[PDB]
Design a protein around this ligand. Structure first.
Ligand SMILES: *[C@@H]1O[C@H](CO)[C@@H](O[C@@H]2O[C@H](CO)[C@@H](O[C@@H]3O[C@H](CO)[C@@H](O)[C@H](O)[C@@H]3O)[C@H](O)[C@H]2NC(C)=O)[C@H](O[C@@H]2O[C@@H](C)[C@@H](O)[C@@H](O)[C@@H]2O)[C@H]1NC(C)=O
Ligand SMILES: CCCCCCCC/N=C1/SC[C@@H]2[C@@H](O)[C@H](O)[C@@H](O)[C@H](O)N12
Ligand SMILES: [K+]
Length: 496
């Protein structure tokens, strides 16, 4: 059953949708040839609302025309999701159980927005309320005392199981570490400037690499398998003197030799050889330099399935020079966006309930990434409190869902819908295809083909001006529509 959004304003540019123990917005059950479906969200308050129109055989005029080039084939989509941090888990479980179910449904269900990716930190990050690794007992090179604590066994793992039961789509898990045990590090601390002791290939590096296998073991004992792991979350962090929360620094040469000598072989000789390894997990300005240092060494290249990027310094990194150039040089190594949130700059408010601007940053990043070959996009924390935490160093940020414990209430923000416009309608295996514009325009738009050959187009209007437009699909026809200011649309049609 479709239930509209209950809107509530907090004085920002748009509303949130209010959900509680007994009510949350949702969709009806799921067109017909020669018609299209349109989903629309607007700053004014529409939330993924469904309409239909006809596909017309002819068209005339000089308005903006967008033309699919379905024979121009690019990358296949892996998918979309968010991260189950310690904070996300504590926030979700702070709700009554029926409200928890509706929050999980909103993300993971086909009646929600159909996430198919969850990122899971290996032990503690800044979005944790205590500092721990899985092997804190000093000098345990054999990892006999490797253990998952309750943050995993009572919080994260049972929530991930419930997300899997809700999903119809297969859901892929991605793991990333922030720090190693402090006794493997040069500075003997979870934060600050410091890297693994010694050099790739030695006892410290072989132990760190075994720690990934032990992690995959412990999770598999709890019946969870991984699609992929990253070699390190933001390895450049640990090069930065005073870095305030968990990290572990690698130069690109250091990452190359660690993956070639320790991490690659250790994974390939385990029962977990099918888990993919992703490198970088860092700002895209490190591209294409890091891809060059690592992937021109055939011993590291043979283990690296892809490159993960974070969005935070995007303003210093035009997409063509980083993503584009990387795909040109290394087209067989997939690009994947592994982490993004807004609110993290020192001078921004962490949480702005109902910010349409923040919603637009999500979809503009997602469309730009798809336009430059990226196969998937993962948000950061799945839910936060109204402060943007908790977070042991107060590195508060915003989230698509904000949980208010004392009201047994949660708020879906514009970000939630800007993401849904893609995750709901672009299943795994969808393939990005060509789309060209007849004149300069202010729209961001991308076109993909579903596995069954039907079409999906996302149109984001970041300007205040209504742009009437047409979408041309060769040998099915023409969709006449309009892209209102501050809107996002998703169009779907069978080519059948
Ligand atoms: C969880 O959230 C849901 C949906 O928002 C709450 O349900 C609803 O409560 C509204 C206000 O309390 C209801 O509204 C009114 O009706 C009359 C006219 O018929 C108006 O004059 C009036 O000003 C309101 O608009 C609304 O009908 C109802 N919405 C739906 C679709 O169910 C729910 O609230 C709780 O249960 C309901 C049935 C009432 O008894 C409420 O008092 C009560 O808060 C929310 N649950 C909680 C704990 O807040
Ligand atoms: C010194 C350069 C500072 C620019 C911002 C650094 C990039 C990270 N910003 C944020 S904002 C919030 C997230 C962190 O919570 C996450 O742990 C990190 O992976 C990531 O650092 N992050
Ligand atoms: K902030």
């Amino acid at each position: 059953f479709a239930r509209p959004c209950i809107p509530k304003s907090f004085g920002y540019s748009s509303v949130v949708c209010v959900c509680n123990a007994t009510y949350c917005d949702s969709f009806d059950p799921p067109p017909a040839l020669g018609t299209f479906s349109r989903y629309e969200s607007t700053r004014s308050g529409r939330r993924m609302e469904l309409s239909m129109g006809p596909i017309q055989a002819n068209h005339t005029g000089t308005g903006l025309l967008l033309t699919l080039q379905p024979e121009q084939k690019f990358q296949k989509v892996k998918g979309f999701g968010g991260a189950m941090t310690d904070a996300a888990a504590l926030n979700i479980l702070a709700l009554s159980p029926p409200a928890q179910n509706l929050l999980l449904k909103s993300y993971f269900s086909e009646e929600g927005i159909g996430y198919n990716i969850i990122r899971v930190p290996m032990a503690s990050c800044d979005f944790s309320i205590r500092t721990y690794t899985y092997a804190d007992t000093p000098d345990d090179f054999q990892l006999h005392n490797f253990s998952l604590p309750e943050e995993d066994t009572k919080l994260k793992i049972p929530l991930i199981h419930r997300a899997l039961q809700l999903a119809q789509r297969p859901v892929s898990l991605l793991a990333s570490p922030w720090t190693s045990p402090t006794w493997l590090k040069t500075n003997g601390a979870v934060n600050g400037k410091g890297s693994l002791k010694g050099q790739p290939g030695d006892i410290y590096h072989q132990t760190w690499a075994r720690y990934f296998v032990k992690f995959l073991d412990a999770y598999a004992e709890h019946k969870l398998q991984f699609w992929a792991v990253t070699a390190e979350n933001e390895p450049s962090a640990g090069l930065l003197s005073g870095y305030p929360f968990q990290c572990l620094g690698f130069t690109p040469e250091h990452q190359r030799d660690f993956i070639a000598r320790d991490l690659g072989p250790t994974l390939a000789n385990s029962t977990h050889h099918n888990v993919r390894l992703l490198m970088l997990d860092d700002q895209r300005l490190l591209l294409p330099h890091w891809a060059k240092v690592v992937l021109t060494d055939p011993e590291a290249a043979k283990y690296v399935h892809g490159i993960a990027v974070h969005w935070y310094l995007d303003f210093l990194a035009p997409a063509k020079a980083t993503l584009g150039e990387t795909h040109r040089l290394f087209p067989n190594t997939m690009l994947f966006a592994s982490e993004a949130c807004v609110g993290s700059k020192f001078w921004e408010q962490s949480v702005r309930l109902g910010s349409w601007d923040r919603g637009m940053q999500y979809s503009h990043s997602i469309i730009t990434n798809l336009l430059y070959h990226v196969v998937g996009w993962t948000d950061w924390n799945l839910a936060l409190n109204p402060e943007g935490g908790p977070n042991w160093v107060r590195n508060f940020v915003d989230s698509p869902i904000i949980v208010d414990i004392t009201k047994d209430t949660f708020y879906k923000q514009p970000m939630f819908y800007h993401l849904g416009h893609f995750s709901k309608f672009i299943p795994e295996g969808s393939q990005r295809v060509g789309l060209v514009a007849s004149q300069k325009n202010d729209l961001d738009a991308v076109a993909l083909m579903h596995p069954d050959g039907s079409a999906v187009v996302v149109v984001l209007n970041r300007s205040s001006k209504d742009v009437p437009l047409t979408i041309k699909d060769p040998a099915v026809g023409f969709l006449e529509t309009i892209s209102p200011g501050y809107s996002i649309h998703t169009y779907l049609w069978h080519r059948q």
